[PDB]
Symmetry: C3
Subunit: 532 residues, 3 copies
């Protein structure tokens, strides 16, 4: 055959055909298509600029580098989220504003398939796009899968508070990609009039963010947030960030006289000079000893008055705005093993007691952000339920998760519903087989777990039972359907109640059935404890 | 009450309220308002670029840094000139393009008070805006006072002689501030139709430079030059200025292949590296031995073809240009103590002889520019009188005070009158009680001594005698009056005649009154000796 | 009397009159006129931007800097080509985009003499326009002589094969210069409507590229490629250029993660650092050990997509374009010394047999580009004649000369004629008395030997036999004659047949007369071998 050559605004791109088991027309895969001028030099800590066009045929057939990050963390995370056979080894570089397209269309003849842009998670500190392969999700549901990349950590979120570096560069890059989709996805047999953005974790948050953003307007028509929203404190910083900006500055060896000089100096820094800082700053890790309130969690989404004019807990009160179908879901055990294992959570002891717990919950401030005077009544309502210690640890994990995703997700759901727009919700309760040999079997539906199903891992990786194969094949149809009509439902699929006043949702998994009031009892509990 | 918040073209500005004995209305003070994008990175050695708008409310409540300069030399000059009880220490930074504002207007009401933009002095090498508190002047004479900082030294006046680095970067910034006042001052209760500029020493010169510049036309409607004008050669480089550049580059450790390579190489140097280079050139201090010509004088205004299209001398010959009220005044003993005290002049024995005076005068070529074969002729007209070593040391000083300010001022003042525009001259004759201890109690009208009766020091510092209080209240009246109507006159004020054909001027002091033909004798003389 | 004062587009320029012994009309000489801004800092590896306008009278009285190149080599070349009295010492600089003018016109009036823009050669690595003095030519044939410069080595030809750095910067310069010519030459007595470009060696290839380039169209009306055309393989990089880039980047100490990264990294390096790399690569020198194929001889012309949309071999096949009188020429013994010497060829023995030559033509792969299976066929065709190991050398040399200048130059002529356009050819056969004392007297008409004739060296230097002086005149008239009407023929000059189907050319030397079929058997044979 002849490699597929799609004509774009900036030039002619070249991909490779990949036939999937059980299909006729192979899928044209494009890896490494630039969507914005490489953010190097004076372009560090600034909005993404349009990319220069090319003279011939760009052979975009290799995996683009992942934005600079913790190479060991990034490779680790890439190994736990991938859906393809073997994980792919990637490189780091400032030049990472790329994306990948998996169109199962017949380029020869005009096509207009729905598009599904995927925003990967990774706490805005790590992660990449190539990690997620759409091949299966593309062919199986006839949708063009697009995976984008955006600057991470310092590169994408360093902010001095003022205007010499408002911040949210990462989120501006996601918006920049979406713009590229709107202007190019058509030549790939996709439809710019039906783009659906969906993410998981940080990516999940980024989604909710772009939703409340005035910039992201008309760039998408449907959104999906998997485990993580905008009301998820940990990723959204509020208040005077100057201190954090200065703290990074000094660490890099930069005078702090004025924000202007600060930003200027960091521009004088190299990639390694900034990768070492990202390391010394120790992000994505809970610092035991030291006042919890001081511990810096991570550089993330901020209020720059551009991408986000106000905080999320503000924009949700207003109705006068653009609304679109929004699917928001969570997992049974978000804080089961993944996160803890990563952030090196102090649980090696086995069980936990009313006293010891109170400490962690407190020291976990950079995550749950809970006032010390609350820890007591907090641990009681959750762990105090039984004298059993082996259940305190579990209830502690179920607790830590209900604060980061539980209540938050539901609160975003109710408002979106109230705002006067289509709203759906789910709860993944399944344990993948592609998990790690080091993950306990007592943990079902951990963090991100739903991804394997969503990205049809059962069809790439081997050793998957027919049960799991049918599950994954199912969630893709729901997802795909939601992408099409904005309503997940269809023929051959269980009924998914629209999250309205009845507050019903779908329990996906072994037995995929509907249910009502998700974490309701819980939300209410925190709707007061968090109000003193 | 509630901190002052004003809306400017670039964003909101948060100020602070300050009260003053005798006035109910609290004066609003804004510190550190940026009138340009921090001239950093490649912006070095280039025109002032418009500031970037902030997205929220900028806190203009801190003292802005002063442009990089001799940290000690600069701090010292600030202690001396300051008009506040307690001097304020300052940080050094390249990011120094800011201005302070003092409005005695109620910002919750429409107000259009005349504006007085002050340009500090310091040989274009040192100085700052935060040094001069506008509080008194403003309240007392009901006007808006704006102290601005402009680029100094290398950063402000480094020229290669050509398009790769014209020069006068500092003068541009000055104008850059005027354009800021014209498009913003209206928000701080200022009338953009009555902007008056007034400087002292180096500031007095530049104020004259704007008067001859096309770029400044329509940015001010009244000017005041205190102890400094454009013909004051020292602060205006003439002839090929390339050599200076090459010697500045060489010192800084730069190549000198071409002009371009030169400018480009300095842009690469660091603030610390140029600051260390500024201290190697030894710019303020007057050398002793060696040949006067080889002696490196200083940087300064230059004929670039933008700010000035030709030497101040020529320019003053054409009246076809627009004209505005100009007030040019000097001080009885300009070279009395202040200047020498810093330049470490060879005065110590308290007495000077004929033979030595000629030798010294010559060693001051960078300050007077007189041929050694002429010195004899001059040293006679002044020192040919009484044969007393003491009266000589005092006469040799009145000698420099004439060749620096005296003659140059009057000629500038005379040429303005000849142009057909309102002119007013003055001579300060008073010794404030705010001087140092190392200052001889026999110097009446030292350099800058008016700066205490102009910025109402008697109402900010302690001790001020009623006489010294009555003086200050009188100058501020004349000054504000000039700024308002372009005429210093008003109620309860002696008559100040216009420097018309009768050549009348004012002798401000304990007992103020009008006179005639100020320094008319020396001018006539010095104009002749310069026959050659 | 007073220096010439011409007013160009970007400003006034001052030059100096210099008369040539004999001529009453003095020639106006200008040196160092910038036709582009200096490609320093961020403008490196980018297209030449228009020069910045100056405000006064720029003195064009010093020789401009020759672009960065090997200092030793750069001098050596300047010494073996210069036609002026005493060689001139030159400085290196990134800022070198300048051209020299030698107008013989009487600037006070309005003259429109023909203009000849000379593009100096040097392998696109070393060279300089100040080397060639045009006082003679401009005077003797009454024409405006121009000597333009253009980025070299890495600085003018580093390409990655993508938009991040397409390449051909040096060519893009030669163009920008030609443009400056069209918009300014008029004020120097020249006729922008009758421009004629010409250059030797790499300079010549540049002519052949402009003529074949669509951008170049309308920037000239006559062309002269002396010893070098666009079909001289060694100068035009075909295939994937990315490999060479990853080689340079690595030698300059850079990361090769992406092309966008390689460039950014090379832009940081100091001009001296890159020069180091230029000396590390070892260009212009024959790699005796290694792989003749992997041994990149020198980066150069490429098919960017801006200047060249396709290989010159695919361009000539299209008569659908703009045609202009072209004069292609070659010398009797091109690879007879100057080249074998500079490259340090192992022919110090003064002889060599077949088993050696066959091995030599191989290592010479970067020049001849002959396969390892053709070596015998080509060796047996040029050396299989005699057995005299000394005369087998002059044939091996003549061999390399035919594949680089011989055949190629002719094929270019045959294609220009056959495309319908005035074509002319010549073979210079003379040994100037200005040759190095190290060049054998047996080598006649070596690379560059015509220069001493074209620029009339016999009139600026001493020791010109009565014969040469005459030759130098004749060729000069021929040249200017071709610049005047695209026809070398005139009065008192041997008839020069147009290179039509009879393939008539002119043999220039001691005895000058036409001939037919130049290198006929040569182009034949060689096209056969290369047919694979
Ligand atoms: C340097 C490399 O090998 N990678 C490839 C890159 C990719 O675009 C980016 O790395 C992202 O995939 O550029 C090409 O695609 C191209 O423009 O022809 C070819 C090249 O092979
Ligand atoms: C030195 C400087 O100018 N930057 C300062 C700005 C100023 O508000 C604006 O610059 C206007 O002065 O913000 C601070 O004052 C602040 O309160 O956080 C600190 C910061 O150093
Ligand atoms: C500006 C510079 O530093 N270069 C030299 C120039 C050259 O003509 C070219 O502009 C650059 O070499 O000549 C000068 O004399 C001039 O008056 O411009 C100054 C200097 O010697
Ligand atoms: C600006 O000053 C106000 C006082 O009115 C204060 O509330 C605010 O914190 C200051 N800005 C910041 C973010 O420090
Ligand atoms: C410029 O050239 C003129 C030529 O006479 C000369 O008078 C002047 O001194 C030169 N300027 C410089 C660079 O010194
Ligand atoms: C790029 O890939 C295409 C498709 O196989 C191939 O034909 C071409 O030679 C390759 N060239 C580059 C740019 O690496």
């Amino acid at each position: 055959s002849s490699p597929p050559v799609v004509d774009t605004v900036h030039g002619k791109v070249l991909g490779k055909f990949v036939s999937l088991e059980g299909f006729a027309q192979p899928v044209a895969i494009f890896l490494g298509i630039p969507f914005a001028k490489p953010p190097l030099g004076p372009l560090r800590f600034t909005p993404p600029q349009p990319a220069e066009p090319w003279s011939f045929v760009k052979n975009a057939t290799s995996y683009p580098p992942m934005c600079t990050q913790d190479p060991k963390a990034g490779q680790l995370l890439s190994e736990l989220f991938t859906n393809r056979k073997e994980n792919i080894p990637l490189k780091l570089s400032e030049d990472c504003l790329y994306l990948n397209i998996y169109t199962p269309a017949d380029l020869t003849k005009k096509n207009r398939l729905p598009v599904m842009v995927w925003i990967h998670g990774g706490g805005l500190m790590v992660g990449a796009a190539s990690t997620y392969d759409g091949l299966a999700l593309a062919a199986h549901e006839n949708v063009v899968v697009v995976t984008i990349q955006y600057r991470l950590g310092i590169w994408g979120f360093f902010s001095t508070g003022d205007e010499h570096s408002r911040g949210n560069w990462g989120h501006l890059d996601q918006v920049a990609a979406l713009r590229w989709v709107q202007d190019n996805i058509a030549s790939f047999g996709g439809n710019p009039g039906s783009v659906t953005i969906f993410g998981e974790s940080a990516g999940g948050e980024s989604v909710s963010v772009l939703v409340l953003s005035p910039l992201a307007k008309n760039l998408f028509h449907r959104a999906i947030s998997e485990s993580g929203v905008a009301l998820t404190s940990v990723l959204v910083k509020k208040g005077d960030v100057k201190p954090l900006a200065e703290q990074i500055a000094i660490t890099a060896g930069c005078k702090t006289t004025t924000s202007a000089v600060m930003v200027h100096c960091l521009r004088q820094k190299t990639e390694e000079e900034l990768l070492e800082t990202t390391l010394k700053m120790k992000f994505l890790s809970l610092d035991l000893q030291g006042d919890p309130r001081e511990s810096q969690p991570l550089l993330g989404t901020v209020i720059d008055g551009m991408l986000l004019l106000k905080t999320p807990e503000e924009l949700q009160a207003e109705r006068n705005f653009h609304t679109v179908p929004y699917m928001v879901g969570i997992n049974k055990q978000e804080f089961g093993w993944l996160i803890p294992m990563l952030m090196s959570y102090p649980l090696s002891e086995g069980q936990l007691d009313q006293k010891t717990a109170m400490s962690l919950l407190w020291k976990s401030y950079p995550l749950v952000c809970i006032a010390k005077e609350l820890i007591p009544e907090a641990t009681e309502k959750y762990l105090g339920g039984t004298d059993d210690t082996v259940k305190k640890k579990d209830l502690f994990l179920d607790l830590i998760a209900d604060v980061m995703f539980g209540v938050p997700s539901v609160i975003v759901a109710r408002n979106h519903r109230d705002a006067g727009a289509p709203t759906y919700m789910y709860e993944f309760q399944y344990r993948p087989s592609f998990s790690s040999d080091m993950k306990p079997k007592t943990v079902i539906g951990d963090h991100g777990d739903e991804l394997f199903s969503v990205f049809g891992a059962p069809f790439l990786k081997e050793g998957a039972s027919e049960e799991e194969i049918r599950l994954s094949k199912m969630v893709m149809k729901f997802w795909a359907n939601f992408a099409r009509n904005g309503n997940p439902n269809g023929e051959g699929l269980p009924h998914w109640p629209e999250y309205n006043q009845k507050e019903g949702y779908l329990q996906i998994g072994a037995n995929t059935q509907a249910a009502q009031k998700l974490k309701d009892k819980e939300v209410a509990f925190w709707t007061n404890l968090f109000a003193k």
